[PDB]
């Protein structure tokens, strides 16, 4: 979690109470205040609680019990007043006299764990020595909690020595507030919320700056690496045996940082307090002058963890005469690493280019507490301040001597001002944006609390944001500061009057009609995944040059074997059909209305277009033309029983004609006419497949799927499918004016014999073309083959309804029209009147 920020409430209150003595607030109210100003509190963790005899003790002896597999030891502990207890433990991270926390019988630990005197192993175990995890204090259960020397005398209450009345807040800081990645930032924000005086913990008013009488180390810097400031200050003669005190290790642990040697513990404590990442180097291991430079084409380098990493030409690293020292603000190597062997250190305080750090730490796949903050910009004005704070805190704990020499690099031009350029903004600009009339002077006061100096000049403010707020660049940024501090809840709710809209487009309206029509006809909509099943087109047996194989590919799919984006909706539908069938739902009709992705040769990437102006019309056309074609398709699949069984009969299985009807349902919903012509197009059955035309434009296919496809894909037998390209179906806005004659109709039937492969629709069209205007309706109701007809023939019988517009049609008039239809079918499809 790169945006996380953990810290104890006691540390926050301490920094805030310096400027406002006696400030204290409940954790619930503090949570609501942080949320009101825009800080997500992900979790509020109170420490403990403990009850009963939970006191700090001193181990008197450790008679190691041998013979077992695990190193079990018996320990005598003094709980104060020289009243010794007998406890048994299996931890091996403490020696005689180390300070530990014990839980005597009668005590209770988090949570619901009452300590009792139980017999275990060869001795009596009336109590136990607790770990950080068992006390709800840390996240380490591998070893027992051992306090640093001199934390508290034996007998003190454990709830007070550990501060189990404290609460630790876990916050998720938005990426524009990197200054809140510290106690300095968060404490400043609270002073703004409660209108309190704030003393900056990185201010020189706390302690005077340490003296500078000369450079601390030879240092050359390349200008194009992007580093804005680099500081060095040595601390000579540290005691390796000395460790960090309890108040420092406690706060460090509560912030998620494990303590190691005191030279590194101060670098992490200062980083958490002020926000400036701190790195400790071993001055004894430094050889020659230090240099900041880009890497070579293949210059590898090992880190402190021993992993060598191939660097890029854009990586910023520090390197001396020997080998590489560290990788910018990512991580340091093992060359200058501080160990128990070290005694002389050289602390570094550097601001690195955020973009450079972001690229390197992301490509090398290793974030860090330092990298997360450098990615979000660090206040360069406090480099030496945090350095002097870090050197003084180190010499105080390890018993060293702060060297009065300091190296500082402020760029090729010695930058003295670290504040962003000033911003001009009208005084009432926050008022107009918020819709609230703020009291006089609210904007200037709020912008002062965040650290900006403002100068009034009529109705225009000149705001110079502080150096820790590089996000404040435009008047809009300043507006956000005023509104979030005043509270967004004061903003009223007025409904804006929108002009007369035009409603839904014809395409949006058609998408609804198709959904309603298919749903009413028994189809269940699914949301189709765009990631194709693995090897679906090979299961379909598609040719190598089938256009559907030309898929767009995702570099980082959730499933490695499914990176291709769907060029057709059928695989997703068939996947959902198999899912339903495998769950016992075998009579299923599904549909989907979604776009596909069809790249062409013109599909490619477009380089960044400047965003300081509107892109040109050719640039807009470039971006549109570069994307794969994404037309809207409608598709459906059917398996099992189309009509269920009931008291009416055994139901009816799905047939290819049901897919043909789904086409006509879509056509009717689209108010277009449609013709179906025979076609061979996988994955459809070559003898049960229609290609769908609107006019002379193909728009899709329908019918029963190929039996070989069905078996290879594990589909139900007889599965049918339809897929149409909605964008190929033209929009129609007809204005019918039907002729409704009230005169009687004449009913006649005609039986026509044709070759068995003459489509019935062609015969009907020929009949219609000859019958003329008197023909009102024609309907095929019988298709017959047999010995009465002849080989390779079939007989079609149509019901004809004739009607005149101005008179009662006579039988002779209708028969003349029928004979003309028979003549037409004879000339066009070779029909013969049935005899």
């Amino acid at each position: 979690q790169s945006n996380a920020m953990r810290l104890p409430y006691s540390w926050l209150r301490e920094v805030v109470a310096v400027g406002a003595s006696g400030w204290d607030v409940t954790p619930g109210e503090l949570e609501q205040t942080l949320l009101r100003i825009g800080h997500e509190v992900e979790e509020v963790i109170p420490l403990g609680p403990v009850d009963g005899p939970v006191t700090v003790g001193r181990v008197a002896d450790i008679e190691e019990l041998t013979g077992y597999k695990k190193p079990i030891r018996a320990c005598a502990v003094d709980i104060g007043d020289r009243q010794y207890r007998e406890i048994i433990c299996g931890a091996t991270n403490f020696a005689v006299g180390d300070l530990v926390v014990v839980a005597l019988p009668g005590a209770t630990l988090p949570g619901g764990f009452t300590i009792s005197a139980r017999k275990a192993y060869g001795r009596n175990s009336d109590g136990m020595i607790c770990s950080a995890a068992e006390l709800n204090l840390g996240a380490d259960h591998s070893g027992i909690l051992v306090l640093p020397p001199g934390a508290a005398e034996p007998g003190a209450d454990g709830a007070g020595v550990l501060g189990l009345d404290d609460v630790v807040f876990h916050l998720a800081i938005t990426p524009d507030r990197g200054y809140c990645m510290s106690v300095r930032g968060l404490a400043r924000e609270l002073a703004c919320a409660y209108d309190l005086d704030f003393v900056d913990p990185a201010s020189n008013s706390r302690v005077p700056p340490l003296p500078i009488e000369g450079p601390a180390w030879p240092l050359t810097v390349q200008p194009e690496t992007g580093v804005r400031r680099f500081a060095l200050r040595p601390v000579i003669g540290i005691d390796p045996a000395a460790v960090s005190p309890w108040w420092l290790q406690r706060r460090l642990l509560l912030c998620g940082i494990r303590a190691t040697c005191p030279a590194v513990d101060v670098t992490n404590y200062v980083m958490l307090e002020l926000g400036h990442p701190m790195h400790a180097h071993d001055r004894n291991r430094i050889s020659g002058t230090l240099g900041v430079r880009f890497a070579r084409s293949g210059e590898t380098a090992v880190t402190l963890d021993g992993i060598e990493r191939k660097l890029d030409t854009a990586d910023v690293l520090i390197v001396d005469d020997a080998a590489t020292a560290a990788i910018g603000g990512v991580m340091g190597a093992a060359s200058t690493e501080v160990r128990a062997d070290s005694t002389d250190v050289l602390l570094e305080a550097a601001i690195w280019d955020p973009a450079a750090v972001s690229r390197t730490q992301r490509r090398l796949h290793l974030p860090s507490e330092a990298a997360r903050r450098y990615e979000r910009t660090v206040d360069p004005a406090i480099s030496v301040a945090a350095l002097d704070r870090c050197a003084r805190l180190l010499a105080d704990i390890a018993g060293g001597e702060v060297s009065p020499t300091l190296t500082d690099w402020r760029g090729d031009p010695p930058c003295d001002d670290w504040s962003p350029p000033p911003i001009r903004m009208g005084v009432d600009v926050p008022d107009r944006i918020a819709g609230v009339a703020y009291p006089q002077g609210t904007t200037a006061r709020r912008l002062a609390q965040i650290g900006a100096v403002v100068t009034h000049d009529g109705d225009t403010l000149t705001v110079t944001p502080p150096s820790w707020r590089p996000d404040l660049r435009q008047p809009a940024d300043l507006v956000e500061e005023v509104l979030r501090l005043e509270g967004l809840e004061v903003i009223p709710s007025v409904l804006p009057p929108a002009p007369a809209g035009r409603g839904l487009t014809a395409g949006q309206q058609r998408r609804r009609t198709i959904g309603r029509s298919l749903a009413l006809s028994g189809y269940v909509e699914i949301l189709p995944t765009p990631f194709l099943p693995a090897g679906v087109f090979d299961l379909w047996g598609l040719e190598a040059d089938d256009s559907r194989r030309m898929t767009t590919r995702v570099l980082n799919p959730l499933e490695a074997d499914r990176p291709q984006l769907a060029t057709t909706l059928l695989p997703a539908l068939l996947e959902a059909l198999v899912r339903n069938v495998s769950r016992g739902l075998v009579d299923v009709a599904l549909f989907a209305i979604a776009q596909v992705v069809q790249p062409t040769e013109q599909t490619r990437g477009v380089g960044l277009i400047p965003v300081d102006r509107r892109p040109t019309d050719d640039e807009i056309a470039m971006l549109d033309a570069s994307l794969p074609r994404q037309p809207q398709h409608v598709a459906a699949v059917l398996a099992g029983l189309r009509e269920p069984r009931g008291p009416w009969g055994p139901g009816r299985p799905v047939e290819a004609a049901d897919a043909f009807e789904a086409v006509r349902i879509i056509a009717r919903a689209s108010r277009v006419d449609v013709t179906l012509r025979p076609a061979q197009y996988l994955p459809w059955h070559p003898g049960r497949c229609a290609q769908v035309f609107v006019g002379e434009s193909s728009v899709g296919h329908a019918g029963q799927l190929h039996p070989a496809v069905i078996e290879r894909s594990g589909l139900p037998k007889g599965t049918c499918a339809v897929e149409l390209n909605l964008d190929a179906i033209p929009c129609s806005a007809p204005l019918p004016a039907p002729r409704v004659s009230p005169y009687p109709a004449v009913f006649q039937d005609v039986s026509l014999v044709v070759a068995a492969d003459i489509p019935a629709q062609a015969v009907a069209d020929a009949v219609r073309a000859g019958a003329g205007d008197l023909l009102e309706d024609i309907a095929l109701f019988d298709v017959f083959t047999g010995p009465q007809i002849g080989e390779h023939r079939k007989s079609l019988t149509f019901a004809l309804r004739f009607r005149a517009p101005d008179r009662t049609l006579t039988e002779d008039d209708a028969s003349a029209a029928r004979d003309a239809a028979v003549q037409s079918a004879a000339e066009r499809v070779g029909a013969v009147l049935r005899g």
Binding site: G38, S358, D477, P496, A498, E525, V554
Partner: protein
């Protein structure tokens, strides 16, 4: 006796939720805007004021499209329709957009890599946060009832300044009436207006975006989000035909 020889089907509940959302804004004079699912990085990120080589962009859960240098992707949100609408239409603009969005989140009970968002955009002379709040309240009252209220609190998005998150309060909720996180919103960033040729000193605007699967989850009490995306007919049919 049973009489249904043609069993009823069902449009998808997410689609029907989208339709109700659409009808709500159409009845307020707004219109529906559209955009493709495979989108350029120009519109998904750059024109929306996302910084480059920065965690606010690189740590997005983005599906990137081959090749490496293509700057093509499955859109992580419907906000690129803001850019497309402002480039295609004359001001003033009052639109919503509803479509699929893609994040690299594993499918589980509360996450789905493919979901739907409703985007809102209003650009006009004199628009303010109060108009944003009036629209969210009307939106909430239509999707959750007359007792629905909205809460707004500061947040961050690169394409809004100020930015906020929308909480919703509706009666007969889960464990009683309480605040549920609903979506994000804010005033349109002036860099977004300048990237489309709009004078920020003359025009202002607000935008918002809510996920439909999330909305359907806490409104209806759907425990497992897998049921919303797997296409089991048993999940859809109890919602009705949708005609």
């Amino acid at each position: 006796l049973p009489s249904t020889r043609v069993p009823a089907g069902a449009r998808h509940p997410i689609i029907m939720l989208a339709e109700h959302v659409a009808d709500t804004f159409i009845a307020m004079g707004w219109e529906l805007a559209e955009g493709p699912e495979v989108e350029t990085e120009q519109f998904n990120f750059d024109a929306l004021n996302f910084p480059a080589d920065h965690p606010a962009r690189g740590e997005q859960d983005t599906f990137y499209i081959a090749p490496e240098d293509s700057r093509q992707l499955l859109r992580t949100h419907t906000s690129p329709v803001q850019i497309r609408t402002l480039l295609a239409r004359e001001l003033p603009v009052y639109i919503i957009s509803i479509g699929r969005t893609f994040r690299t989140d594993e499918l589980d009970a509360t996450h789905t890599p493919i979901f739907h968002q409703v985007e809102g955009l209003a650009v006009d002379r004199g628009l303010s946060m109060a108009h944003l709040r009036g629209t969210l309240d009307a939106f909430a009252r239509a999707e959750f009832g007359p007792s629905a209220r909205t809460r707004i609190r500061p947040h961050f998005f690169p394409f809004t300044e100020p930015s906020a998150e929308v909480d919703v309060w509706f009666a007969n909720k889960i464990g009683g009436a309480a605040w549920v996180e609903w979506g994000g919103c804010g005033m349109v960033h002036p860099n977004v207006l300048r990237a489309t040729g709009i004078d920020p000193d003359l025009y202002s605007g607000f935008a918002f975006g809510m996920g439909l699967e999330r909305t359907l989850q806490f409104r209806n009490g759907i425990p497992d989000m897998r049921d919303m995306v797997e296409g089991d007919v048993r999940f859809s049919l109890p919602f009705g035909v949708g005609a």
